[PDB]
Design a protein around this nucleic acid. Structure first.
Ligand code: MG
Length: 430
DNA sequence: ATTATGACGCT
DNA sequence: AGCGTCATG
């Protein structure tokens, strides 16, 4: 009762740039704007692999991880932009730089955690307190929430999308208690006002549109973000959780989309996240371990404690290339040439990182895949990264991997390599 | 031949 | 340290 925590102490948002690489290309090339468009890596094999898809193209069934030739079967007018190639490989610098533009804007409003190139969590708790003090008990107008959906509303006693959105928002705001500065629902609503302002600033200052979720923790904010895309935001209140979870497949919750989620489904014989409430914490820990069991117990009630980490920069800087099928590397000269290409891109990115961010990486991770290995990485080995020099880095990587060549001939490499990966890690301030 | 990343957990 | 999982609706 009065002692049961409800996990309503924070306001957290998740901001996701809509089809981010597509938007970067559409800003650069106006002919791609408001068209079915996708971004592809490479071209020779089946037209290249699609990695980002505009919402107009998604309407035709185009998706990521589809070959461009196949996408063109679904969408003959699909427009394509290709990722830049440098040193024989895809080079994502344009998108990393555009991501920095967006993250720097977001950081003006609140502390952000860079979850990925196109996604950031935002801790809004303090900003909401400040805005509530500035809002001396003044109600929140629907005009301050022009792109906000309130999940679960309208309910109870028009046939157009925007009309439905406004009906739900009106029900929410009429129900609000704008007098109580500690009301979690009011706090979320102010959070949504701030996120509208942040999203407007991003669009004005970059041209990029985003969707967002606002809730009391990261998992619910992420789930909320997915409910209304593109270019919209969704508020998931604590009270909305029972209904929302009652038909929510377990795999939709962040971290449960893989083997653990499949095991929850199979072991417990359930389908939906709300069904988890019927198990005790000890029962869940007995199946899924102490940590996962406690997390599931709280998360199915809408409660999660994982903090928004104050981290706007990536923790690693990596360069990776697959060599699939016939392109696998089979000679020593070939392996060394590609290690050098990767290391030259890595050196360029590291030197820029050091100038921009006042830090230096101290560990080099080298990973390879060998032909016929079911795992993504056949081997990972670390060595010291003491100098930002591509030739030294590629020589050191060759040194750490050279004992995997089972070929008795040092000129040949066997079995051929299907992946090379260099990653700089363990940054220290400088 | 579902890339090229990048997060975090386990032991 | 090296390996595995999860994510990119
Ligand atoms: Mg996105």
């Amino acid at each position: 009762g009065p002692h049961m925590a409800t996990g309503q102490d924070r306001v957290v948002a998740l901001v996701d740039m809509d089809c981010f690489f597509v938007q970067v290309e559409q800003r650069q090339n106006p002919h791609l704007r408001n068209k079915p468009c996708a971004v592809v890596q490479y071209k020779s094999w089946k037209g290249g692999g699609i990695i980002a898809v505009s919402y107009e193209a998604r309407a035709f069934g185009v998706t990521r991880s589809m070959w461009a030739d196949d996408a063109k079967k679904l969408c003959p007018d699909l427009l394509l932009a290709q990722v830049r190639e440098s040193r024989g490989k895809a080079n994502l610098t344009k998108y990393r730089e555009a991501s920095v533009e967006v993250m720097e804007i977001m950081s003006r409003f609140a502390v952000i955690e860079r979850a990925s190139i196109d996604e950031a969590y935002v801790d809004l708790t303090s900003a909401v307190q400040e805005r509530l003090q500035k809002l001396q008990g003044q109600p929140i107008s629907a005009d301050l929430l022009p792109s906000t959906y309130i999940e679960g509303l309208p309910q109870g006693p028009t046939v157009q999308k925007e009309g439905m959105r406004k009906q739900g928002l009106f029900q929410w705001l009429d129900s609000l208690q704008i007098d109580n500065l500690t009301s979690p629902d009011l706090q979320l609503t102010v959070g949504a006002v701030i996120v509208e302002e942040m999203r407007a600033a991003i669009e004005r200052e970059t041209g990029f549109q985003c969707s967002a979720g606002i809730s009391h923790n990261k998992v619910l904010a992420k789930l909320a973000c997915g409910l209304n895309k593109p270019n919209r935001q969704t508020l998931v209140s604590h009270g909305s959780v029972p209904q929302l979870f009652s038909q929510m497949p377990i795999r939709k919750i962040r971290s449960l989309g893989g083997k653990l989620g499949a095991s929850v489904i199979e072991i417990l014989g359930i389908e939906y996240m709300g069904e988890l409430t019927q198990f005790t914490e000890s029962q869940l820990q007995s199946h899924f371990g102490e940590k996962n069991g406690s997390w599931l117990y709280a998360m199915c009630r809408g409660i999660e404690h994982d903090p928004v980490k104050p981290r706007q920069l990536p923790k690693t800087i990596g360069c990776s290339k697959n060599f699939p099928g016939k392109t696998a590397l089979a000679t020593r000269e070939q392996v060394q040439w590609w290690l050098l290409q990767l290391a030259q891109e890595l050196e360029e990115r590291l030197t820029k990182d050091r100038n921009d961010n006042d830090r230096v990486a101290t560990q080099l991770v080298v990973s390879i895949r060998v032909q016929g290995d079911k795992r993504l990485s056949s081997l990972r080995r670390c060595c010291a990264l003491t100098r930002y020099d591509a030739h030294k880095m590629s020589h050191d990587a060759f040194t750490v991997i050279k004992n995997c060549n089972t070929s008795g001939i040092q000129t040949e490499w066997s079995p051929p390599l299907t992946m090379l990966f260099l990653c700089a890690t363990k940054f220290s301030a400088s």
